[PDB]
Amino acid sequence: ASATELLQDYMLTLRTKLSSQEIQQFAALLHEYRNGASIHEFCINLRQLYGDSRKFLLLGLRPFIPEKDSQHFENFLETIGVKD
Numbered sequence: 001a002s003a004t005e006l007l008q009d010y011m012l013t014l015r016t017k018l019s020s021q022e023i024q025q026f027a028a029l030l031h032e033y034r035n036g037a038s039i040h041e042f043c044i045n046l047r048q049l050y051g052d053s054r055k056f057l058l059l060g061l062r063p064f065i066p067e068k069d070s071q072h073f074e075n076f077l078e079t080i081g082v083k084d
Contacts, residue, residue, distance in 0.1 A: 039069035
């Protein structure tokens with residue numbers, strides 16, 4: 001399964017859990033990040049957006065994080081408790 005396909009599946013999932021406004025917040029975050037914003041900022045903002053109650057949806061973003069930021073992202077996931 002390609003990243004393109006994975007992202008289509010992921011967005012279909014997100015639209016069942018996030019509101020219309022949250023989905024566009026997500027889009028804008030993924031956009032700032034793909035354009036040079038730091039992984040630290042991306043992660044903290046995602047956490048705030050999804051909130052505690054939807055944090056497990058963050059696992060699904062794995063395929064979209066570039067290898068350079070993979071360690072930071074995995075550590076983030078561990079820290080907020082989605083890898084417990």
